[PDB]
Symmetry: C3
Subunit: 256 residues, 3 copies
């Protein structure tokens, strides 16, 4: 015992994971299984889904005797998760049929220990599996560039339109003061693989998304310096920031 | 074609020019002429005039077939002008009888292009020529010091008084909590010409200015590390921050 | 003359002293005596007392012909004390039966002088002497760690409980979202004396304090990288940040 004990070497990883999506959802259902953690959250309007996978390899110690679903409020969780040092050892702890989850920050010298208890919510766990097999288009680019594009075009419009034609990625915003149009071209840079812009287009796309939601999605930069985007004319877009053993995904419904 | 094409090597220059005076005026009339750009703006209360000159030498490419007057709202313009990278190539573009102006940010590698359109205002262009031949006093000092003096004395009073006697520059503020008085002495420092404080006094002066307006005027520091001030008992004061090929001027009316 | 002339080599020291406690009191009575300065302030609810001592050795020049009591408003004083450069020479100046105190910032090169006048308040000077001879417990630790503990646990509760048992220091907060418990262990580190955590316990203690007030008390970090805490079951706790020739003390009443 206890039933669940998940020990990150550095609290920084989980701090950043929660930074990745704390601003766009109020409630989150974590599910800790023998093979690692997954989590889902949806916003008030059911246009944004957050899906998280943390494999067992991301922990320095992991044990979960039985799957549990832990419902948490993001304000409470983020407050508590701000209490660590980035280099502290962090341990999620839970018992059978838990009323709360324990977060244990431990010093690297063993001088101090900060133990926090977080009351859990009751949340009916209706996990969605909306990821498609094929998407019309797939691209990947540096997350900082995605952030710059989104933050720029957000000043002009509530809505940002992503258009993909062969060898051409285009972001557009139209508003009262004016309009903006960023055109980026795919290229593989061998001197700096991290700057590359990659595109695979089985079918061209023209989709519109709420700027409010893209502004939250770009906060996945805290986890990865690149972002993958999968776009479908019939389904939500998928924005993915990889971990070394997992990922953070945002599924965002286009505007009709 | 087009009629007007003005290409800054770095968007940073125009970004800073607009930072210099975006906070003190809502509307601005630019006038692009064969020999460069000038611009004017006045505030709601007609106590502050902003006058800008950008010579042809400040651009890496400049062409303007015919003079045009472009009325712009500062909020819109500043929003759009925040969208560039500082090292991007920036190009103002306009056509005959334009309804909008285009701002084109281009990558140094040609990977991406951000094109923005800004709707223009209708503004009757009544350009003022209020600069005097002789001013009672003329001084110059490091813009950071001007900013420190103004920001300090602004905490004590709505009004800051500039007094000039021979070899003595003095700033004063009187208020409820108390009063403050900064006295600076002219000196030419050869080890650091940029720190010098220079004064020419044909007649002593004693003028009062609204602190709210000096607080905006000091934002011309983004363009030059020195500021020139010309003071007249009968006319608005002139605060000037030079460019390598132009200048930014603020004419501020004294309080009666 | 004048009667009082107290000259700090760097305005930074007094700037930091006032930063130490400007946020927790509105009015302050300074008392300048032949042997240095002391000061007291109490908050609206008479749960927090601020006590300051600045010995003559902390000044580069000090002269006070006769004790004076100077009542000052913290907003006014802090505004004026923000007007200096950290390396300016600062001089407090007062005359017999003063209506105001003068603060004189002087350049190290003698180029400029900023002279400020601060109107004084009328405050009946009822100085308290509530410090005890013996306290149940006494500890000391790095002020940054005290700040981290307080800022963390403040997110969870209005109240923070300090428990001291032999060789164990414990901070606790209980709230709606959950609870937190930091346990620190005394240790003397010879490689870094500044990181040590020292404890002397004549009797164990269990005291509760308003988080709002601890959040202000931790701002004494601007004066010292260590904090001493003296805890009594019958009296206010004493939080002390030392100067090289004086100290800043906060006496905080426990919650019944």
């Amino acid at each position: 015992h206890h039933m669940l004990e998940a020990k990150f070497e550095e609290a920084s990883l989980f701090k950043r994971i929660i930074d990745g999506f704390k601003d766009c959802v109020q409630l989150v259902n974590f599910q800790c299984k023998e093979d690692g953690i997954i989590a889902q959250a949806v916003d008030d309007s059911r246009v944004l889904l957050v899906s998280l996978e943390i494999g067992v390899e991301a922990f320095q110690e992991y044990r979960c005797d039985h799957p549990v679903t832990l419902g948490m409020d993001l304000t409470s969780l983020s407050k508590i998760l701000a209490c660590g040092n980035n280099t502290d050892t962090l341990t999620l702890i839970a018992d059978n049929t838990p009323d709360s989850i324990i977060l244990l920050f431990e010093d690297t010298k063993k001088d101090r220990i900060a133990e926090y208890s977080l009351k859990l919510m009751d949340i009916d766990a209706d996990f969605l599996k909306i990821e498609e097999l094929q998407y019309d288009s797939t691209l990947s680019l540096p997350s900082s560039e995605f952030s710059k594009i989104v933050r720029d075009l957000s000043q002009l419009s509530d809505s940002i339109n992503i258009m993909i034609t062969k060898e051409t990625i285009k972001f557009v915003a139209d508003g009262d003061i004016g309009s903006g149009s960023v055109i980026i071209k795919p290229f593989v840079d061998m001197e700096h693989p991290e700057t590359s812009i990659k595109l695979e287009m089985d079918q061209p796309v023209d989709l519109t998304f709420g700027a409010k939601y893209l502004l939250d999605i770009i906060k996945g930069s805290s986890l990865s310096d690149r972002v993958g985007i999968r776009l479908s004319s019939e389904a939500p877009a998928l924005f993915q920031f990889d971990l070394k053993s997992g990922f953070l995904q945002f599924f965002l419904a286009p505007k009709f």
